[PDB]
Design a protein around this ligand. Structure first.
Ligand SMILES: *[C@H](O)[C@H](C[C@@H]1CCNC1=O)NC(=O)[C@H](CC(C)(C)C)NC(=O)[C@@H](NC(=O)OCc1ccccc1)C(C)C
Ligand SMILES: *[C@H](O)[C@H](C[C@@H]1CCNC1=O)NC(=O)[C@H](CC(C)(C)C)NC(=O)[C@@H](NC(=O)OCc1ccccc1)C(C)C
Lengths: 306, 306
């Protein structure tokens, strides 16, 4: 028993991290087969960064301008090309540590692990959710760009995020591995704001099921509600709408605990209307929304990976 | 910017995890050089476990009773011996993935990363603190015994914890890697209880400094207090005493933020006496105590590891 914010084991990704230095910029790259993926704004300098034209900046570059460093071994760049907001640097050596992988784009509400890196060297690993407003609430310092977010599916690493920038509220924006931003952000030093966020309702209910599996039941109640009456309550509290699909994904957790999804909705309603009365749930005094139904099942059932 | 509960990258430890099966018990082992470390209660079966005599149970075992599995490669056991509550199984193959390592025993209040494993296969990684009552609040299911907790110091892995058991409040108990339990617990199925916990005051103050570095300042105040007047307030709220040493370790954070340690104590006092008034600090509605002063510096400064 117990419930923790749990990251995927990071070994498979640590072996793919390299340092990319060009001009006055150093950042992290992702080395899979003979390609190194990194944020395209490495080809910049601090005045290029007010409003650049990356297509122009890139034809001015030479292969030998890109210093790629895999630990204490240098990689020769033999080609370069830009795919949206990422650079693909072709190197003459294929990474012998390349895991089975996919590039996947995730949906708001879904979670992933982030391997925070500096200078090609992993610093820490932590779990994140993609917020409804396509930001993530990460922990990133200068030099962390090119760190990647990922999920693991048995032995396959699905890369879903590459880090690019911090927005003024301390939240973070980035791209998928094909270089397409999550949300309406651009890799420019121009005024940009996150936009209004909402709470991920299906994840909150999942975390309430995790609590019940773990012995926290005080918030349960005999009442029930309709899907429609629940969604009027979520609207007011800035929760995002609950669909019949979300009810289906919560079926397994409903079955394991004996609590109908719509009964747990009625509990969420009262929690929203009454607060928590100085009590806690799974050691939080807030309703937590960064655990998906799948995260809960993995942790409360013991799924592993090879 | 941003602050997250951040684990160490786990790759160095993933390469050391193996599966140990003996009789009707399967658990995880730690494979360093030609020795596999695992909990001694693997040599048990479910009626041995009410009150065993492990010295007796172990001389009855044969080397060939221990099935050690490093992925899809079996390791031959060539010797066995017991060191307190862990077994050391000598195998004829040294682990080519053995990192530089140390066995260290940690102090209550200190943190570490846990690589939760089942059947020798890593499942997830998360950060823990050793509670004042020598339990940890982990996430462990049946089959997770032998999972280890650790810190990384540049390239060196300091192993500090091996998992053994869950106590009735859902908290977890284990040993250091020399097999000596943290706290007054024994690896027996006899009635055992955690004992009264307290809040780790120095870590709470560290997390308040992390908040200030990250832009949360609402809890700051013009007031101050003495170390002595602060400790009378901590006593009442079940916080553990703050020493002049703790004030010294908080010096760096005090210097970076311009907030004297005793000024942050006065803020903690009011937070303890008034609550948080429905506000949050670093996205928590509770005072968080599982970040050490070092954890805060690492995350707010960007220390890496190779
Ligand atoms: C890559 O190492 C780095 C990662 C940042 C550094 C601090 N935290 C991080 O996650 N990314 C950058 O330095 C960005 C570079 C560009 C913009 C992608 C070229 N810069 C930023 O992240 C900056 N954000 C912005 O410039 O955009 C928002 C904004 C809002 C208002 C006015 C101007 C710009 C921040 C300021 C570091
Ligand atoms: C090892 O895989 C496993 C890990 C447990 C399983 C569930 N969560 C975990 O962390 N450890 C065990 O199964 C323990 C085996 C012994 C006791 C070390 C031989 N057993 C336990 O963890 C059990 N705890 C106790 O038996 O001790 C406390 C207690 C309190 C009151 C009455 C009897 C015993 C629990 C019940 C699984």
């Amino acid at each position: 028993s117990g419930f923790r914010k749990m990251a995927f084991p990071s070994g498979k990704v640590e072996g793919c991290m390299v340092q990319v230095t060009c001009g006055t910029t150093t950042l992290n790259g992702l080395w899979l087969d003979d390609v190194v993926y990194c944020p395209r704004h490495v080809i910049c300098t601090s005045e290029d960064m007010l409003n650049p034209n990356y297509e122009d900046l890139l034809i001015r570059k030479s292969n030998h301008n890109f210093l790629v460093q895999a630990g204490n071994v240098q990689l020769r760049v033999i080609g370069h090309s830009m795919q949206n907001c990422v650079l693909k640097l072709k190197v003459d050596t294929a990474n012998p540590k390349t895991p089975k992988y996919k590039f996947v784009r995730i949906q708001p509400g879904q979670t992933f692990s982030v391997l925070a890196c500096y200078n090609g060297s992993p610093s820490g690993v932590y779990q994140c959710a993609m917020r409804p407003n396509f930001t993530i609430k990460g922990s990133f310092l200068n030099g962390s760009c090119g760190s990647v977010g990922f999920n693991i599916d048995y032995d396959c690493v699905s890369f879903c995020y590459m880090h690019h920038m911090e927005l003024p509220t301390g939240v973070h924006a980035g791209t998928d591995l094909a270089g397409n931003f999550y949300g309406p952000f651009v890799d420019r030093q121009t005024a940009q704001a996150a936009g209004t966020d909402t709470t991920i309702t299906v994840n909150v209910l999942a975390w309430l099921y995790a609590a019940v599996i773990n012995g926290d039941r005080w918030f349960l109640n005999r009442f029930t509600t309709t899907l429609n009456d629940f969604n009027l309550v979520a609207m007011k509290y800035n929760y995002e709408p609950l669909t019949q699909d979300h009810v289906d994904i919560l079926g397994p957790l409903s079955a394991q605990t004996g609590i109908a999804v719509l009964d747990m909705c009625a509990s969420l309603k009262e929690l929203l209307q009454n607060g928590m009365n100085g009590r806690t749930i799974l050691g939080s005094a807030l309703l937590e929304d960064e655990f998906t139904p799948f995260d809960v099942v993995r942790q409360c059932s013991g799924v592993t990976f090879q």
